[PDB]
Symmetry: C3
Subunit: 57 residues, 3 copies
């Protein structure tokens, strides 16, 4: 019998991982082009959010 | 006893809030650098999506 | 009676669609400004992730 709640929890975790992994990859490309300055506290704040989310997943 | 569906609903809402809050913060940094022009209707359309999602959460 | 698991599954699918649609729209604006180079394999990798996610939803 289908474990509906376990499967939906796994779908949410996996989906959140894919979303935060994409956010990390875009942010590293924007920092490499220098679009955003890694020295700026507002940019550091973005980086810390993505990092926090990936370690949590 | 664990309220599994209530807890998974709270996890989804909280996760969506964190994702849309990040989208808003990146978009304001890209508009401040003028990478995207706030005058452009396609950029306004992004802004309205993030705004709609944050008010809904 | 409320179909709680069916409704939470629909909320997750719809939310993921809105998140990946936003990612696609931002990436096309950043490629149009040439912030990111569509010729770069790392940028192609972003594009393929968003594309994969939208076709799956």
């Amino acid at each position: 019998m289908e474990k509906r709640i376990e499967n939906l929890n796994k779908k949410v975790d996996d989906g959140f991982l894919d979303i935060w992994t994409y956010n990390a990859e875009l942010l590293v490309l924007l920092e490499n082009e220098r679009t955003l300055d890694y020295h700026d506290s507002n940019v550091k704040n973005l980086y810390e959010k993505v990092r926090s989310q990936l370690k949590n997943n």
